[PDB]
Design an enzyme around this catalytic site. Structure first.
Site, PDB file in Angstrom:
ATOM      1  N   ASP A  61      13.055 -19.499  -7.251  1.00 54.84           N
ATOM      2  CA  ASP A  61      13.090 -20.831  -6.642  1.00 54.84           C
ATOM      3  C   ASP A  61      13.884 -20.784  -5.338  1.00 54.84           C
ATOM      4  O   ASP A  61      15.120 -20.866  -5.357  1.00 54.84           O
ATOM      5  CB  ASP A  61      13.713 -21.832  -7.617  1.00 54.84           C
ATOM      6  CG  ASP A  61      13.728 -23.255  -7.080  1.00 54.84           C
ATOM      7  OD1 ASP A  61      13.072 -23.527  -6.056  1.00 54.84           O
ATOM      8  OD2 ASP A  61      14.409 -24.105  -7.710  1.00 54.84           O
ATOM      9  N   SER A  95       7.787 -26.730  11.391  1.00 56.54           N
ATOM     10  CA  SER A  95       6.406 -26.419  11.719  1.00 56.54           C
ATOM     11  C   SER A  95       6.014 -27.060  13.042  1.00 56.54           C
ATOM     12  O   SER A  95       6.481 -28.144  13.396  1.00 56.54           O
ATOM     13  CB  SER A  95       5.470 -26.907  10.609  1.00 56.54           C
ATOM     14  OG  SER A  95       4.119 -26.607  10.916  1.00 56.54           O
TER      15      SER A  95
HETATM   16  C1  LIG Z   1      20.266 -27.989  -6.587  1.00 54.04           C
HETATM   17  C2  LIG Z   1      20.347 -28.916  -5.401  1.00 54.04           C
HETATM   18  C3  LIG Z   1      21.501 -28.969  -4.622  1.00 54.04           C
HETATM   19  C4  LIG Z   1      21.598 -29.827  -3.541  1.00 54.04           C
HETATM   20  C5  LIG Z   1      20.536 -30.652  -3.218  1.00 54.04           C
HETATM   21  C6  LIG Z   1      19.359 -30.640  -3.965  1.00 54.04           C
HETATM   22  C7  LIG Z   1      18.228 -31.578  -3.631  1.00 54.04           C
HETATM   23  C8  LIG Z   1      19.293 -29.762  -5.048  1.00 54.04           C
HETATM   24  O1  LIG Z   1      18.139 -29.746  -5.816  1.00 54.04           O
HETATM   25  C9  LIG Z   1      17.185 -28.719  -5.525  1.00 54.04           C
HETATM   26  C10 LIG Z   1      15.792 -29.136  -5.937  1.00 54.04           C
HETATM   27  O2  LIG Z   1      15.620 -30.184  -6.553  1.00 54.04           O
HETATM   28  N1  LIG Z   1      14.795 -28.303  -5.622  1.00 54.04           N
HETATM   29  C11 LIG Z   1      13.395 -28.613  -5.881  1.00 54.04           C
HETATM   30  C12 LIG Z   1      12.728 -29.095  -4.585  1.00 54.04           C
HETATM   31  C13 LIG Z   1      13.477 -30.205  -3.886  1.00 54.04           C
HETATM   32  C14 LIG Z   1      14.427 -29.919  -2.914  1.00 54.04           C
HETATM   33  C15 LIG Z   1      15.111 -30.939  -2.272  1.00 54.04           C
HETATM   34  C16 LIG Z   1      14.855 -32.255  -2.592  1.00 54.04           C
HETATM   35  C17 LIG Z   1      13.914 -32.552  -3.555  1.00 54.04           C
HETATM   36  C18 LIG Z   1      13.229 -31.534  -4.199  1.00 54.04           C
HETATM   37  C19 LIG Z   1      12.656 -27.400  -6.465  1.00 54.04           C
HETATM   38  O3  LIG Z   1      12.845 -26.243  -5.652  1.00 54.04           O
HETATM   39  C20 LIG Z   1      13.090 -27.018  -7.872  1.00 54.04           C
HETATM   40  C21 LIG Z   1      12.293 -27.643  -9.017  1.00 54.04           C
HETATM   41  C22 LIG Z   1      12.079 -26.574 -10.095  1.00 54.04           C
HETATM   42  C23 LIG Z   1      11.549 -27.114 -11.401  1.00 54.04           C
HETATM   43  C24 LIG Z   1      11.917 -28.376 -11.846  1.00 54.04           C
HETATM   44  C25 LIG Z   1      11.429 -28.872 -13.045  1.00 54.04           C
HETATM   45  C26 LIG Z   1      10.570 -28.114 -13.811  1.00 54.04           C
HETATM   46  C27 LIG Z   1      10.197 -26.859 -13.379  1.00 54.04           C
HETATM   47  C28 LIG Z   1      10.683 -26.360 -12.181  1.00 54.04           C
HETATM   48  N2  LIG Z   1      11.012 -28.196  -8.572  1.00 54.04           N
HETATM   49  C29 LIG Z   1      10.791 -29.513  -8.469  1.00 54.04           C
HETATM   50  O4  LIG Z   1      11.669 -30.355  -8.646  1.00 54.04           O
HETATM   51  C30 LIG Z   1       9.362 -29.934  -8.099  1.00 54.04           C
HETATM   52  C31 LIG Z   1       9.311 -31.386  -7.551  1.00 54.04           C
HETATM   53  C32 LIG Z   1       9.989 -31.484  -6.189  1.00 54.04           C
HETATM   54  C33 LIG Z   1       7.878 -31.904  -7.461  1.00 54.04           C
HETATM   55  N3  LIG Z   1       8.482 -29.696  -9.249  1.00 54.04           N
HETATM   56  C34 LIG Z   1       8.916 -30.188 -10.561  1.00 54.04           C
HETATM   57  C35 LIG Z   1       8.306 -29.369 -11.681  1.00 54.04           C
HETATM   58  C36 LIG Z   1       6.832 -29.172 -11.491  1.00 54.04           C
HETATM   59  N4  LIG Z   1       6.569 -28.708 -10.139  1.00 54.04           N
HETATM   60  C37 LIG Z   1       7.306 -29.059  -9.046  1.00 54.04           C
HETATM   61  O5  LIG Z   1       6.873 -28.802  -7.938  1.00 54.04           O
END
Ligand SMILES: Cc1cccc(C)c1OCC(=O)N[C@@H](Cc1ccccc1)[C@@H](O)C[C@H](Cc1ccccc1)NC(=O)[C@H](C(C)C)N1CCCNC1=O
Length: 330
Positions: free
Chosen positions: A35, A199
């Site tokens: 991730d 982009s």
């Molecule tokens: C950890 C952290 C620190 C500071 C600030 C923030 C926003 C922080 O959060 C980071 C964060 O949420 N990152 C996400 C994308 C992010 C970064 C910043 C802001 C908001 C989002 C993403 O990479 C990780 C996480 C992985 C995951 C979650 C649940 C089940 C399985 C996998 N993936 C998801 O949330 C995605 C969402 C966005 C549609 N997701 C959920 C499942 C299914 N598929 C999928 O695509």
């Protein structure tokens, strides 16, 4: 040193990708979601609430002779979709495709939210964003890449995600046979802790390229491509019958449609996402309405170049003193 591991879609829609990771002594192999949008390495474990485990492989630190409890350390994360997990912390040996880090913080889950329980194929996450986002308290811990970087032949890792097929994560080297043409590099802001870049624009199908700056993050842990509403409206307007559904929560389209490609700019270079990559199948089993792979970022607050975009490219995450991002066609 270098490492190389195969990454595999968890299902027929490429909803996520899992990569085998060896933890502890003797090795316990868990399949983790790499991730680049988070910075915690956390795992299902022998400590996870039993009702919240449903088919995952667990890490058992008491069976690892190299595991050490990190005294007083806890972690808690909430992701962009509202999913969450929390627990305590061990240090242990962690290897990815032949690359070994000793003393890696392995965050053992005591609690996970339902979306993790319901995904039997994902045993945890391996964060590859910047260590400033790591959630361990009271002493923040470093990512696997941060710990390995000084030992690598080059301070880089690369993501080569497949469409309906296996792909590869490499650490420490660039496989020049894995892409076509040249790699175009672009500037990264680390101020939010992400691989955040700009982009240069987009095109829909064979249409005119629109030069416009789109700030967003390269996130292997997000499935879809989340872009500004104006861009997403322009894309789906080219798909007869597509509409934004408030009940479904995004753009849907008739499953009989042929989707146009979507092109995004990296400097003067162009990455073409084939139309098929944007099809995420029926909204519910047996429906003839399909869910789109390009969606509005309006509800999110940030644009996200997730797997839909990244799997169309060979992507270099350059962790030099000033990090940059590279994209090549493949
Ligand atoms: C950890 C952290 C620190 C500071 C600030 C923030 C926003 C922080 O959060 C980071 C964060 O949420 N990152 C996400 C994308 C992010 C970064 C910043 C802001 C908001 C989002 C993403 O990479 C990780 C996480 C992985 C995951 C979650 C649940 C089940 C399985 C996998 N993936 C998801 O949330 C995605 C969402 C966005 C549609 N997701 C959920 C499942 C299914 N598929 C999928 O695509």
């Amino acid at each position: 040193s270098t490492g190389s591991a195969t990454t595999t879609p968890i299902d027929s829609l490429d909803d996520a990708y899992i990569t085998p990771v060896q933890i502890g002594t003797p090795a316990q192999t868990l399949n983790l979601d790499f991730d680049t949008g988070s910075s915690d390495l956390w795992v299902f474990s022998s400590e996870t609430t039993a009702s919240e485990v449903d088919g995952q492989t667990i890490y058992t630190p008491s069976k690892s002779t190299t595991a050490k409890l990190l005294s007083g350390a806890t972690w808690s994360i909430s992701y962009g979709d509202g999913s969450s997990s929390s627990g305590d912390v061990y240090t242990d040996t962690v290897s990815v495709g032949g690359l070994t880090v000793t003393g890696q913080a392995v965050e053992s889950a005591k609690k996970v939210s339902s979306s993790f329980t319901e995904d039997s194929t994902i045993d945890g996450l391996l964060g590859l964003a910047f260590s400033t986002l790591n959630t361990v308290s009271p002493t923040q811990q470093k990512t696997f890449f941060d710990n390995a970087k000084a030992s690598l032949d080059s301070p880089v890792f690369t993501a080569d995600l497949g469409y309906h097929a296996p792909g590869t994560y490499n650490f420490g080297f660039i496989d020049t046979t894995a892409y076509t043409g040249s790699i175009t590099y672009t500037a990264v802001s680390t101020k939010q802790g992400f691989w955040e870049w700009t982009s240069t624009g987009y095109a829909v199908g064979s249409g005119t390229f629109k030069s416009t700056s789109i700030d967003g993050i390269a996130d292997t842990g997000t499935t879809l491509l989340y872009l500004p509403a104006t861009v997403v409206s322009a894309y789906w307007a080219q798909v007869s019958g597509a509409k934004s559904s408030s009940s479904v929560g995004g753009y849907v389209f008739p499953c009989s449609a042929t989707l146009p490609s979507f092109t995004f700019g990296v400097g003067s270079a162009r990455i073409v996402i084939p139309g098929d990559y944007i099809d995420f199948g029926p909204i519910s089993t047996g429906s003839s309405s399909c869910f789109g792979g390009i969606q509005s970022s309006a509800g999110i607050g940030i644009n996200i170049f997730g797997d839909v975009a990244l799997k169309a490219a060979f992507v270099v995450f350059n962790g030099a003193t000033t990090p940059t991002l590279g994209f090549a066609s493949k």
